[PDB]
PDB file of all heavy atoms in Angstrom:
ATOM      1  N   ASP A   1      36.787  32.093 -44.711  1.00 29.92           N
ATOM      2  CA  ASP A   1      36.384  33.511 -44.597  1.00 29.92           C
ATOM      3  C   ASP A   1      37.047  34.251 -45.763  1.00 29.92           C
ATOM      4  O   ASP A   1      37.568  33.613 -46.687  1.00 29.92           O
ATOM      5  CB  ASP A   1      36.778  34.082 -43.335  1.00 29.92           C
ATOM      6  CG  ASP A   1      36.224  33.417 -42.090  1.00 29.92           C
ATOM      7  OD1 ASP A   1      35.135  33.803 -41.752  1.00 29.92           O
ATOM      8  OD2 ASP A   1      37.009  32.578 -41.497  1.00 29.92           O
ATOM      9  N   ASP A   2      36.960  35.593 -45.695  1.00 32.58           N
ATOM     10  CA  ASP A   2      37.673  36.332 -46.600  1.00 32.58           C
ATOM     11  C   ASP A   2      39.134  36.336 -46.475  1.00 32.58           C
ATOM     12  O   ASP A   2      39.641  36.325 -45.289  1.00 32.58           O
ATOM     13  CB  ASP A   2      37.105  37.764 -46.713  1.00 32.58           C
ATOM     14  CG  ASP A   2      35.885  37.863 -47.472  1.00 32.58           C
ATOM     15  OD1 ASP A   2      35.865  37.379 -48.752  1.00 32.58           O
ATOM     16  OD2 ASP A   2      34.846  38.447 -47.005  1.00 32.58           O
ATOM     17  N   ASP A   3      39.797  36.372 -47.632  1.00 30.78           N
ATOM     18  CA  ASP A   3      41.189  36.487 -47.619  1.00 30.78           C
ATOM     19  C   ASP A   3      41.840  37.637 -46.878  1.00 30.78           C
ATOM     20  O   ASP A   3      42.988  37.713 -46.509  1.00 30.78           O
ATOM     21  CB  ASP A   3      41.675  36.510 -49.061  1.00 30.78           C
ATOM     22  CG  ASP A   3      40.967  37.622 -49.982  1.00 30.78           C
ATOM     23  OD1 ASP A   3      40.077  38.274 -49.510  1.00 30.78           O
ATOM     24  OD2 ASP A   3      41.187  37.581 -51.132  1.00 30.78           O
ATOM     25  N   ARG A   4      41.007  38.663 -46.690  1.00 30.14           N
ATOM     26  CA  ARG A   4      41.412  39.827 -45.982  1.00 30.14           C
ATOM     27  C   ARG A   4      41.727  39.539 -44.515  1.00 30.14           C
ATOM     28  O   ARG A   4      42.453  40.272 -43.901  1.00 30.14           O
ATOM     29  CB  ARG A   4      40.152  40.848 -45.994  1.00 30.14           C
ATOM     30  CG  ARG A   4      40.676  42.250 -46.005  1.00 30.14           C
ATOM     31  CD  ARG A   4      41.301  42.608 -47.352  1.00 30.14           C
ATOM     32  NE  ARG A   4      40.299  42.322 -48.480  1.00 30.14           N
ATOM     33  CZ  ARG A   4      40.610  41.633 -49.595  1.00 30.14           C
ATOM     34  NH1 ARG A   4      41.875  41.217 -49.906  1.00 30.14           N
ATOM     35  NH2 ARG A   4      39.670  41.317 -50.454  1.00 30.14           N
ATOM     36  N   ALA A   5      41.351  38.316 -44.001  1.00 27.29           N
ATOM     37  CA  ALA A   5      41.648  37.900 -42.709  1.00 27.29           C
ATOM     38  C   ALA A   5      43.141  37.700 -42.458  1.00 27.29           C
ATOM     39  O   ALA A   5      43.574  37.771 -41.237  1.00 27.29           O
ATOM     40  CB  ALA A   5      40.891  36.537 -42.412  1.00 27.29           C
ATOM     41  N   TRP A   6      43.807  37.495 -43.481  1.00 27.55           N
ATOM     42  CA  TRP A   6      45.329  37.350 -43.278  1.00 27.55           C
ATOM     43  C   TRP A   6      46.072  38.475 -44.027  1.00 27.55           C
ATOM     44  O   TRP A   6      47.210  38.825 -43.721  1.00 27.55           O
ATOM     45  CB  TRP A   6      45.886  35.930 -43.738  1.00 27.55           C
ATOM     46  CG  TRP A   6      45.634  35.651 -45.180  1.00 27.55           C
ATOM     47  CD1 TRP A   6      44.436  35.018 -45.665  1.00 27.55           C
ATOM     48  CD2 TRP A   6      46.458  35.882 -46.290  1.00 27.55           C
ATOM     49  NE1 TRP A   6      44.584  34.882 -47.003  1.00 27.55           N
ATOM     50  CE2 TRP A   6      45.814  35.382 -47.359  1.00 27.55           C
ATOM     51  CE3 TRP A   6      47.669  36.430 -46.425  1.00 27.55           C
ATOM     52  CZ2 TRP A   6      46.389  35.520 -48.697  1.00 27.55           C
ATOM     53  CZ3 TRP A   6      48.345  36.533 -47.572  1.00 27.55           C
ATOM     54  CH2 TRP A   6      47.688  36.085 -48.804  1.00 27.55           C
ATOM     55  N   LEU A   7      45.476  39.061 -45.070  1.00 27.70           N
ATOM     56  CA  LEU A   7      45.979  40.171 -45.805  1.00 27.70           C
ATOM     57  C   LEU A   7      45.907  41.464 -45.071  1.00 27.70           C
ATOM     58  O   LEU A   7      46.655  42.393 -45.126  1.00 27.70           O
ATOM     59  CB  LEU A   7      45.318  40.265 -47.110  1.00 27.70           C
ATOM     60  CG  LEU A   7      45.704  39.271 -48.136  1.00 27.70           C
ATOM     61  CD1 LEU A   7      44.509  39.082 -49.098  1.00 27.70           C
ATOM     62  CD2 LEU A   7      46.895  39.706 -48.926  1.00 27.70           C
ATOM     63  N   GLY A   8      44.783  41.583 -44.358  1.00 26.64           N
ATOM     64  CA  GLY A   8      44.631  42.778 -43.445  1.00 26.64           C
ATOM     65  C   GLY A   8      44.015  43.877 -44.189  1.00 26.64           C
ATOM     66  O   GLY A   8      42.838  44.115 -44.099  1.00 26.64           O
ATOM     67  N   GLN A   9      44.828  44.523 -44.937  1.00 22.94           N
ATOM     68  CA  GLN A   9      44.327  45.688 -45.750  1.00 22.94           C
ATOM     69  C   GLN A   9      44.726  45.547 -47.188  1.00 22.94           C
ATOM     70  O   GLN A   9      44.286  46.361 -47.991  1.00 22.94           O
ATOM     71  CB  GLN A   9      44.754  46.982 -45.193  1.00 22.94           C
ATOM     72  CG  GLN A   9      43.892  48.178 -45.560  1.00 22.94           C
ATOM     73  CD  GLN A   9      44.516  49.437 -45.485  1.00 22.94           C
ATOM     74  OE1 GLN A   9      45.358  49.799 -44.660  1.00 22.94           O
ATOM     75  NE2 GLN A   9      44.065  50.353 -46.350  1.00 22.94           N
ATOM     76  N   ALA A  10      45.488  44.532 -47.411  1.00 22.90           N
ATOM     77  CA  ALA A  10      45.978  44.343 -48.766  1.00 22.90           C
ATOM     78  C   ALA A  10      44.741  43.837 -49.732  1.00 22.90           C
ATOM     79  O   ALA A  10      44.236  42.693 -49.464  1.00 22.90           O
ATOM     80  CB  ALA A  10      47.166  43.384 -48.835  1.00 22.90           C
ATOM     81  N   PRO A  11      44.447  44.570 -50.830  1.00 25.16           N
ATOM     82  CA  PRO A  11      43.340  44.197 -51.632  1.00 25.16           C
ATOM     83  C   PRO A  11      43.767  43.026 -52.652  1.00 25.16           C
ATOM     84  O   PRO A  11      43.311  43.070 -53.787  1.00 25.16           O
ATOM     85  CB  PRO A  11      42.981  45.401 -52.423  1.00 25.16           C
ATOM     86  CG  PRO A  11      43.875  46.537 -51.847  1.00 25.16           C
ATOM     87  CD  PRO A  11      45.030  45.737 -51.267  1.00 25.16           C
ATOM     88  N   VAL A  12      44.432  42.138 -52.178  1.00 27.43           N
ATOM     89  CA  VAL A  12      44.922  40.914 -52.877  1.00 27.43           C
ATOM     90  C   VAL A  12      43.698  40.029 -53.017  1.00 27.43           C
ATOM     91  O   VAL A  12      42.950  39.858 -52.045  1.00 27.43           O
ATOM     92  CB  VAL A  12      46.083  40.219 -52.175  1.00 27.43           C
ATOM     93  CG1 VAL A  12      46.479  38.926 -52.902  1.00 27.43           C
ATOM     94  CG2 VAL A  12      47.270  41.240 -52.154  1.00 27.43           C
ATOM     95  N   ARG A  13      43.491  39.469 -54.155  1.00 24.93           N
ATOM     96  CA  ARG A  13      42.441  38.490 -54.439  1.00 24.93           C
ATOM     97  C   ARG A  13      42.929  37.136 -54.293  1.00 24.93           C
ATOM     98  O   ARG A  13      43.777  36.652 -55.082  1.00 24.93           O
ATOM     99  CB  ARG A  13      41.761  38.729 -55.748  1.00 24.93           C
ATOM    100  CG  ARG A  13      40.706  37.762 -56.041  1.00 24.93           C
ATOM    101  CD  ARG A  13      39.556  37.716 -55.036  1.00 24.93           C
ATOM    102  NE  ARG A  13      38.509  36.754 -55.432  1.00 24.93           N
ATOM    103  CZ  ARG A  13      37.186  36.990 -55.477  1.00 24.93           C
ATOM    104  NH1 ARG A  13      36.735  38.225 -55.297  1.00 24.93           N
ATOM    105  NH2 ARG A  13      36.369  36.025 -55.579  1.00 24.93           N
ATOM    106  N   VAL A  14      42.547  36.398 -53.325  1.00 23.40           N
ATOM    107  CA  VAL A  14      42.724  35.028 -53.116  1.00 23.40           C
ATOM    108  C   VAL A  14      41.733  34.324 -54.027  1.00 23.40           C
ATOM    109  O   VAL A  14      40.426  34.633 -53.924  1.00 23.40           O
ATOM    110  CB  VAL A  14      42.634  34.668 -51.654  1.00 23.40           C
ATOM    111  CG1 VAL A  14      42.280  33.208 -51.417  1.00 23.40           C
ATOM    112  CG2 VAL A  14      43.934  35.043 -50.977  1.00 23.40           C
ATOM    113  N   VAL A  15      42.161  33.422 -54.791  1.00 24.21           N
ATOM    114  CA  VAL A  15      41.326  32.717 -55.652  1.00 24.21           C
ATOM    115  C   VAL A  15      41.222  31.289 -55.483  1.00 24.21           C
ATOM    116  O   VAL A  15      42.216  30.633 -55.093  1.00 24.21           O
ATOM    117  CB  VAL A  15      41.715  32.967 -57.216  1.00 24.21           C
ATOM    118  CG1 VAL A  15      41.537  34.388 -57.578  1.00 24.21           C
ATOM    119  CG2 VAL A  15      43.242  32.634 -57.308  1.00 24.21           C
ATOM    120  N   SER A  16      40.043  30.737 -55.655  1.00 27.47           N
ATOM    121  CA  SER A  16      39.729  29.402 -55.532  1.00 27.47           C
ATOM    122  C   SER A  16      39.908  28.745 -56.907  1.00 27.47           C
ATOM    123  O   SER A  16      39.164  29.028 -57.879  1.00 27.47           O
ATOM    124  CB  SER A  16      38.315  29.333 -54.962  1.00 27.47           C
ATOM    125  OG  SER A  16      37.485  30.279 -55.711  1.00 27.47           O
ATOM    126  N   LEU A  17      40.924  27.892 -57.053  1.00 25.73           N
ATOM    127  CA  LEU A  17      41.158  27.192 -58.283  1.00 25.73           C
ATOM    128  C   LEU A  17      40.590  25.785 -58.373  1.00 25.73           C
ATOM    129  O   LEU A  17      40.505  25.177 -57.285  1.00 25.73           O
ATOM    130  CB  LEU A  17      42.672  27.195 -58.664  1.00 25.73           C
ATOM    131  CG  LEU A  17      43.334  28.581 -58.877  1.00 25.73           C
ATOM    132  CD1 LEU A  17      44.719  28.416 -59.356  1.00 25.73           C
ATOM    133  CD2 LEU A  17      42.542  29.294 -59.940  1.00 25.73           C
ATOM    134  N   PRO A  18      40.181  25.290 -59.484  1.00 25.74           N
ATOM    135  CA  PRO A  18      39.812  23.893 -59.691  1.00 25.74           C
ATOM    136  C   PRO A  18      40.998  22.938 -59.470  1.00 25.74           C
ATOM    137  O   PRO A  18      40.723  21.716 -59.442  1.00 25.74           O
ATOM    138  CB  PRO A  18      39.455  23.844 -61.203  1.00 25.74           C
ATOM    139  CG  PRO A  18      39.159  25.288 -61.517  1.00 25.74           C
ATOM    140  CD  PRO A  18      40.122  26.063 -60.868  1.00 25.74           C
ATOM    141  N   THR A  19      42.168  23.430 -59.336  1.00 26.31           N
ATOM    142  CA  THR A  19      43.313  22.640 -59.061  1.00 26.31           C
ATOM    143  C   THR A  19      43.288  22.309 -57.533  1.00 26.31           C
ATOM    144  O   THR A  19      43.705  23.077 -56.631  1.00 26.31           O
ATOM    145  CB  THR A  19      44.690  23.232 -59.527  1.00 26.31           C
ATOM    146  OG1 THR A  19      45.721  22.438 -59.066  1.00 26.31           O
ATOM    147  CG2 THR A  19      44.857  24.653 -59.043  1.00 26.31           C
ATOM    148  N   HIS A  20      42.700  21.208 -57.194  1.00 26.68           N
ATOM    149  CA  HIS A  20      42.564  20.743 -55.943  1.00 26.68           C
ATOM    150  C   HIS A  20      43.654  19.689 -55.707  1.00 26.68           C
ATOM    151  O   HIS A  20      44.475  19.467 -56.597  1.00 26.68           O
ATOM    152  CB  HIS A  20      41.189  20.013 -55.835  1.00 26.68           C
ATOM    153  CG  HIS A  20      40.486  20.124 -54.562  1.00 26.68           C
ATOM    154  ND1 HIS A  20      40.110  19.081 -53.756  1.00 26.68           N
ATOM    155  CD2 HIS A  20      39.991  21.307 -53.860  1.00 26.68           C
ATOM    156  CE1 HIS A  20      39.564  19.488 -52.643  1.00 26.68           C
ATOM    157  NE2 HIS A  20      39.411  20.837 -52.728  1.00 26.68           N
ATOM    158  N   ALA A  21      43.654  19.113 -54.474  1.00 23.01           N
ATOM    159  CA  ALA A  21      44.683  18.054 -54.207  1.00 23.01           C
ATOM    160  C   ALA A  21      44.613  17.019 -55.317  1.00 23.01           C
ATOM    161  O   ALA A  21      45.641  16.548 -55.819  1.00 23.01           O
ATOM    162  CB  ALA A  21      44.281  17.355 -52.863  1.00 23.01           C
ATOM    163  N   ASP A  22      43.380  16.562 -55.696  1.00 23.09           N
ATOM    164  CA  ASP A  22      43.224  15.751 -56.813  1.00 23.09           C
ATOM    165  C   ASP A  22      41.803  15.944 -57.385  1.00 23.09           C
ATOM    166  O   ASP A  22      40.854  15.312 -57.124  1.00 23.09           O
ATOM    167  CB  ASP A  22      43.523  14.312 -56.571  1.00 23.09           C
ATOM    168  CG  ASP A  22      43.444  13.449 -57.823  1.00 23.09           C
ATOM    169  OD1 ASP A  22      44.370  13.550 -58.582  1.00 23.09           O
ATOM    170  OD2 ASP A  22      42.403  12.759 -58.070  1.00 23.09           O
ATOM    171  N   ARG A  23      41.705  16.990 -58.153  1.00 24.71           N
ATOM    172  CA  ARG A  23      40.487  17.282 -58.899  1.00 24.71           C
ATOM    173  C   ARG A  23      40.781  17.426 -60.372  1.00 24.71           C
ATOM    174  O   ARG A  23      39.957  17.115 -61.294  1.00 24.71           O
ATOM    175  CB  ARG A  23      39.807  18.505 -58.472  1.00 24.71           C
ATOM    176  CG  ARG A  23      38.582  18.949 -59.312  1.00 24.71           C
ATOM    177  CD  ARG A  23      37.332  18.173 -58.998  1.00 24.71           C
ATOM    178  NE  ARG A  23      36.779  18.659 -57.692  1.00 24.71           N
ATOM    179  CZ  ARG A  23      35.715  18.168 -57.251  1.00 24.71           C
ATOM    180  NH1 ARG A  23      35.010  17.091 -57.704  1.00 24.71           N
ATOM    181  NH2 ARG A  23      35.103  18.647 -56.079  1.00 24.71           N
ATOM    182  N   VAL A  24      41.989  17.920 -60.674  1.00 27.01           N
ATOM    183  CA  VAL A  24      42.378  18.410 -61.937  1.00 27.01           C
ATOM    184  C   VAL A  24      42.152  17.464 -63.074  1.00 27.01           C
ATOM    185  O   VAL A  24      42.846  16.523 -63.369  1.00 27.01           O
ATOM    186  CB  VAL A  24      43.686  19.182 -61.932  1.00 27.01           C
ATOM    187  CG1 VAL A  24      44.889  18.236 -61.427  1.00 27.01           C
ATOM    188  CG2 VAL A  24      43.917  19.877 -63.214  1.00 27.01           C
ATOM    189  N   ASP A  25      41.109  17.701 -63.788  1.00 24.63           N
ATOM    190  CA  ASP A  25      40.712  16.936 -64.972  1.00 24.63           C
ATOM    191  C   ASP A  25      41.196  17.749 -66.140  1.00 24.63           C
ATOM    192  O   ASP A  25      41.620  18.862 -65.990  1.00 24.63           O
ATOM    193  CB  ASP A  25      39.234  16.675 -65.145  1.00 24.63           C
ATOM    194  CG  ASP A  25      38.563  15.955 -63.922  1.00 24.63           C
ATOM    195  OD1 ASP A  25      38.741  14.793 -63.744  1.00 24.63           O
ATOM    196  OD2 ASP A  25      37.688  16.551 -63.246  1.00 24.63           O
ATOM    197  N   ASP A  26      40.996  17.256 -67.344  1.00 27.81           N
ATOM    198  CA  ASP A  26      41.274  17.963 -68.594  1.00 27.81           C
ATOM    199  C   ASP A  26      40.411  19.200 -68.698  1.00 27.81           C
ATOM    200  O   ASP A  26      40.828  20.173 -69.347  1.00 27.81           O
ATOM    201  CB  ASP A  26      40.964  17.049 -69.797  1.00 27.81           C
ATOM    202  CG  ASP A  26      41.386  17.621 -71.102  1.00 27.81           C
ATOM    203  OD1 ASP A  26      40.495  18.354 -71.732  1.00 27.81           O
ATOM    204  OD2 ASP A  26      42.401  17.473 -71.599  1.00 27.81           O
ATOM    205  N   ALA A  27      39.251  19.204 -68.040  1.00 25.74           N
ATOM    206  CA  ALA A  27      38.364  20.373 -68.016  1.00 25.74           C
ATOM    207  C   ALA A  27      38.789  21.297 -67.005  1.00 25.74           C
ATOM    208  O   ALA A  27      38.820  22.583 -67.122  1.00 25.74           O
ATOM    209  CB  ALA A  27      36.948  19.924 -67.820  1.00 25.74           C
ATOM    210  N   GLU A  28      39.290  20.770 -65.850  1.00 25.42           N
ATOM    211  CA  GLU A  28      39.737  21.564 -64.740  1.00 25.42           C
ATOM    212  C   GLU A  28      41.010  22.325 -65.042  1.00 25.42           C
ATOM    213  O   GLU A  28      41.126  23.531 -64.551  1.00 25.42           O
ATOM    214  CB  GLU A  28      39.884  20.758 -63.514  1.00 25.42           C
ATOM    215  CG  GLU A  28      38.698  20.019 -63.066  1.00 25.42           C
ATOM    216  CD  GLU A  28      37.496  20.938 -62.693  1.00 25.42           C
ATOM    217  OE1 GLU A  28      37.478  21.398 -61.565  1.00 25.42           O
ATOM    218  OE2 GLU A  28      36.597  20.981 -63.515  1.00 25.42           O
ATOM    219  N   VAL A  29      41.878  21.691 -65.787  1.00 26.49           N
ATOM    220  CA  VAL A  29      43.164  22.319 -66.129  1.00 26.49           C
ATOM    221  C   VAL A  29      43.001  23.587 -66.931  1.00 26.49           C
ATOM    222  O   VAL A  29      43.570  24.606 -66.580  1.00 26.49           O
ATOM    223  CB  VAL A  29      44.042  21.368 -66.836  1.00 26.49           C
ATOM    224  CG1 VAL A  29      43.518  21.031 -68.306  1.00 26.49           C
ATOM    225  CG2 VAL A  29      45.507  21.739 -67.038  1.00 26.49           C
ATOM    226  N   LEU A  30      41.991  23.609 -67.820  1.00 27.68           N
ATOM    227  CA  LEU A  30      41.661  24.786 -68.660  1.00 27.68           C
ATOM    228  C   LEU A  30      41.147  25.870 -67.806  1.00 27.68           C
ATOM    229  O   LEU A  30      41.525  27.029 -67.987  1.00 27.68           O
ATOM    230  CB  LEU A  30      40.641  24.435 -69.734  1.00 27.68           C
ATOM    231  CG  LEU A  30      40.960  23.062 -70.512  1.00 27.68           C
ATOM    232  CD1 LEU A  30      39.718  22.712 -71.372  1.00 27.68           C
ATOM    233  CD2 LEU A  30      42.141  23.250 -71.329  1.00 27.68           C
ATOM    234  N   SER A  31      40.300  25.501 -66.926  1.00 29.51           N
ATOM    235  CA  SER A  31      39.622  26.299 -65.957  1.00 29.51           C
ATOM    236  C   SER A  31      40.694  26.972 -65.154  1.00 29.51           C
ATOM    237  O   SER A  31      40.437  28.167 -64.766  1.00 29.51           O
ATOM    238  CB  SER A  31      38.812  25.330 -65.149  1.00 29.51           C
ATOM    239  OG  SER A  31      37.658  24.867 -65.956  1.00 29.51           O
ATOM    240  N   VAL A  32      41.768  26.286 -64.816  1.00 27.77           N
ATOM    241  CA  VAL A  32      42.912  26.971 -64.121  1.00 27.77           C
ATOM    242  C   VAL A  32      43.636  27.968 -65.092  1.00 27.77           C
ATOM    243  O   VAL A  32      43.756  29.082 -64.793  1.00 27.77           O
ATOM    244  CB  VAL A  32      43.916  25.898 -63.642  1.00 27.77           C
ATOM    245  CG1 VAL A  32      45.069  26.593 -62.916  1.00 27.77           C
ATOM    246  CG2 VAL A  32      43.201  24.871 -62.651  1.00 27.77           C
ATOM    247  N   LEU A  33      43.979  27.447 -66.237  1.00 29.03           N
ATOM    248  CA  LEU A  33      44.679  28.201 -67.284  1.00 29.03           C
ATOM    249  C   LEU A  33      44.093  29.588 -67.517  1.00 29.03           C
ATOM    250  O   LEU A  33      44.773  30.589 -67.407  1.00 29.03           O
ATOM    251  CB  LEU A  33      44.834  27.438 -68.552  1.00 29.03           C
ATOM    252  CG  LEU A  33      45.394  26.036 -68.572  1.00 29.03           C
ATOM    253  CD1 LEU A  33      45.406  25.409 -69.943  1.00 29.03           C
ATOM    254  CD2 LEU A  33      46.847  26.083 -67.913  1.00 29.03           C
ATOM    255  N   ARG A  34      42.778  29.631 -67.833  1.00 31.25           N
ATOM    256  CA  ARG A  34      42.049  30.797 -68.138  1.00 31.25           C
ATOM    257  C   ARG A  34      41.843  31.757 -66.922  1.00 31.25           C
ATOM    258  O   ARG A  34      41.517  32.899 -67.097  1.00 31.25           O
ATOM    259  CB  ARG A  34      40.759  30.562 -69.041  1.00 31.25           C
ATOM    260  CG  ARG A  34      39.748  29.557 -68.476  1.00 31.25           C
ATOM    261  CD  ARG A  34      39.112  29.965 -67.050  1.00 31.25           C
ATOM    262  NE  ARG A  34      38.468  31.249 -67.127  1.00 31.25           N
ATOM    263  CZ  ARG A  34      37.977  31.913 -66.146  1.00 31.25           C
ATOM    264  NH1 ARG A  34      38.100  31.391 -64.863  1.00 31.25           N
ATOM    265  NH2 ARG A  34      37.332  33.077 -66.312  1.00 31.25           N
ATOM    266  N   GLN A  35      42.182  31.265 -65.765  1.00 30.21           N
ATOM    267  CA  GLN A  35      41.966  32.008 -64.565  1.00 30.21           C
ATOM    268  C   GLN A  35      43.108  32.953 -64.401  1.00 30.21           C
ATOM    269  O   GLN A  35      43.000  34.166 -64.169  1.00 30.21           O
ATOM    270  CB  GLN A  35      41.686  31.091 -63.354  1.00 30.21           C
ATOM    271  CG  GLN A  35      40.964  31.731 -62.092  1.00 30.21           C
ATOM    272  CD  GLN A  35      41.581  33.025 -61.634  1.00 30.21           C
ATOM    273  OE1 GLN A  35      41.051  34.222 -61.912  1.00 30.21           O
ATOM    274  NE2 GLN A  35      42.587  32.992 -60.759  1.00 30.21           N
ATOM    275  N   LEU A  36      44.253  32.365 -64.505  1.00 30.63           N
ATOM    276  CA  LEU A  36      45.517  33.152 -64.163  1.00 30.63           C
ATOM    277  C   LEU A  36      45.806  34.147 -65.236  1.00 30.63           C
ATOM    278  O   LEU A  36      46.109  35.352 -64.921  1.00 30.63           O
ATOM    279  CB  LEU A  36      46.772  32.240 -63.914  1.00 30.63           C
ATOM    280  CG  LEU A  36      46.758  31.165 -62.896  1.00 30.63           C
ATOM    281  CD1 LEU A  36      45.742  31.439 -61.678  1.00 30.63           C
ATOM    282  CD2 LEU A  36      46.493  29.832 -63.520  1.00 30.63           C
ATOM    283  N   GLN A  37      45.525  33.775 -66.497  1.00 32.04           N
ATOM    284  CA  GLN A  37      45.675  34.674 -67.572  1.00 32.04           C
ATOM    285  C   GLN A  37      44.662  35.820 -67.454  1.00 32.04           C
ATOM    286  O   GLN A  37      44.888  36.866 -68.148  1.00 32.04           O
ATOM    287  CB  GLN A  37      45.701  34.088 -68.987  1.00 32.04           C
ATOM    288  CG  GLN A  37      44.491  33.317 -69.299  1.00 32.04           C
ATOM    289  CD  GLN A  37      44.243  33.160 -70.796  1.00 32.04           C
ATOM    290  OE1 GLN A  37      44.689  33.989 -71.559  1.00 32.04           O
ATOM    291  NE2 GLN A  37      43.631  32.084 -71.254  1.00 32.04           N
ATOM    292  N   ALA A  38      43.589  35.604 -66.796  1.00 28.80           N
ATOM    293  CA  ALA A  38      42.611  36.739 -66.608  1.00 28.80           C
ATOM    294  C   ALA A  38      43.038  37.621 -65.523  1.00 28.80           C
ATOM    295  O   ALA A  38      42.942  38.864 -65.590  1.00 28.80           O
ATOM    296  CB  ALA A  38      41.255  36.081 -66.254  1.00 28.80           C
ATOM    297  N   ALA A  39      43.721  37.008 -64.452  1.00 29.88           N
ATOM    298  CA  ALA A  39      44.134  37.746 -63.319  1.00 29.88           C
ATOM    299  C   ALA A  39      45.436  38.574 -63.737  1.00 29.88           C
ATOM    300  O   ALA A  39      45.728  39.583 -63.150  1.00 29.88           O
ATOM    301  CB  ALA A  39      44.396  36.920 -62.199  1.00 29.88           C
ATOM    302  N   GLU A  40      46.190  38.024 -64.671  1.00 29.29           N
ATOM    303  CA  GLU A  40      47.427  38.683 -65.202  1.00 29.29           C
ATOM    304  C   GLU A  40      47.159  40.044 -65.743  1.00 29.29           C
ATOM    305  O   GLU A  40      48.142  40.885 -65.906  1.00 29.29           O
ATOM    306  CB  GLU A  40      48.074  37.797 -66.274  1.00 29.29           C
ATOM    307  CG  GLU A  40      49.042  36.825 -65.732  1.00 29.29           C
ATOM    308  CD  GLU A  40      50.230  37.481 -65.106  1.00 29.29           C
ATOM    309  OE1 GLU A  40      51.012  38.107 -65.849  1.00 29.29           O
ATOM    310  OE2 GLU A  40      50.375  37.438 -63.887  1.00 29.29           O
ATOM    311  N   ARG A  41      45.960  40.357 -66.004  1.00 28.79           N
ATOM    312  CA  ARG A  41      45.610  41.700 -66.517  1.00 28.79           C
ATOM    313  C   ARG A  41      45.746  42.742 -65.425  1.00 28.79           C
ATOM    314  O   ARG A  41      45.738  43.974 -65.658  1.00 28.79           O
ATOM    315  CB  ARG A  41      44.139  41.656 -67.064  1.00 28.79           C
ATOM    316  CG  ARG A  41      43.959  40.681 -68.200  1.00 28.79           C
ATOM    317  CD  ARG A  41      44.907  40.844 -69.336  1.00 28.79           C
ATOM    318  NE  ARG A  41      44.734  39.771 -70.334  1.00 28.79           N
ATOM    319  CZ  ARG A  41      45.588  38.969 -70.807  1.00 28.79           C
ATOM    320  NH1 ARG A  41      46.887  39.085 -70.403  1.00 28.79           N
ATOM    321  NH2 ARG A  41      45.430  38.169 -71.777  1.00 28.79           N
ATOM    322  N   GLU A  42      45.796  42.260 -64.179  1.00 26.92           N
ATOM    323  CA  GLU A  42      45.878  43.178 -63.055  1.00 26.92           C
ATOM    324  C   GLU A  42      47.274  43.138 -62.458  1.00 26.92           C
ATOM    325  O   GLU A  42      47.712  43.989 -61.653  1.00 26.92           O
ATOM    326  CB  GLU A  42      44.941  42.768 -62.029  1.00 26.92           C
ATOM    327  CG  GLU A  42      43.516  42.777 -62.430  1.00 26.92           C
ATOM    328  CD  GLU A  42      42.621  42.076 -61.391  1.00 26.92           C
ATOM    329  OE1 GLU A  42      42.509  42.620 -60.271  1.00 26.92           O
ATOM    330  OE2 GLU A  42      42.176  41.001 -61.667  1.00 26.92           O
ATOM    331  N   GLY A  43      48.172  42.250 -62.954  1.00 27.52           N
ATOM    332  CA  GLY A  43      49.549  42.096 -62.512  1.00 27.52           C
ATOM    333  C   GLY A  43      49.913  40.663 -62.343  1.00 27.52           C
ATOM    334  O   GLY A  43      49.040  39.857 -62.590  1.00 27.52           O
TER     335      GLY A  43
END
């Protein structure tokens, strides 16, 4: 469901990363890298 289910009212964005238990390929790693540096713009 939405992350709001545990945050309640906190507008925190829970993100789904390609970094799975074991998914992380050379392509997935980049996909992770560029996600956090994108989110870093908000804090």
